[PDB]
Amino acid sequence: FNFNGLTGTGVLTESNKKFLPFQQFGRDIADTTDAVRDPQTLEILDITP
Amino acid sequence: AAAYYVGYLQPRTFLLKYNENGTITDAVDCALDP
Numbered sequence: 352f353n354f355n356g357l358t359g360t361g362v363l364t365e366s367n368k369k370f371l372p373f374q375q376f377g378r379d380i381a382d383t384t385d386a387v388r389d390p391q392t393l394e395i396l397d398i399t400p
Numbered sequence: 401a402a403a404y405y406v407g408y409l410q411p412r413t414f415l416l417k418y419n420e421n422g423t424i425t426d427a428v429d430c431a432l433d434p
């Protein structure tokens with residue numbers, strides 16, 4: 352995947368997190384990206400290895 | 401018929417707490433007490 356320039360690999364799943372309007376990505380304790388917002392449908396997906 | 405307050409900021413280290421929804425609900429100011 353390549354989300355707004357951020358490239359990676361994994362499985363995308365529907366999520367239940369509610370980002371604030373000014374947020375685009377989310378991180379875990381290890382500091383890796385875990386959730387993203389689709390730039391077109393504006394839905395939020397979870398990224399799993 | 402109102403009031404206002406004024407405080408100044410300094411560089412500090414804080415320990416913030418996020419909840420299950422992502423809201424900040426607590427914090428600790430490290431350079432205050434032992």
Ligand SMILES: *[C@@H]1O[C@H](CO)[C@@H](O)[C@H](O)[C@H]1NC(C)=O
Pocket residue numbers: 390391392
């Ligand atoms: C991009 O197009 C989709 C429909 O394909 C639309 O839902 C979306 O609103 C458009 N972009 C943004 C930023 O909304």
Ligand SMILES: *[C@@H]1O[C@H](CO)[C@@H](O)[C@H](O)[C@H]1NC(C)=O
Pocket residue numbers: 420421
């Ligand atoms: C925060 O998330 C929990 C579930 O993780 C939910 O039950 C609760 O209503 C949420 N708080 C809100 C929506 O203010």
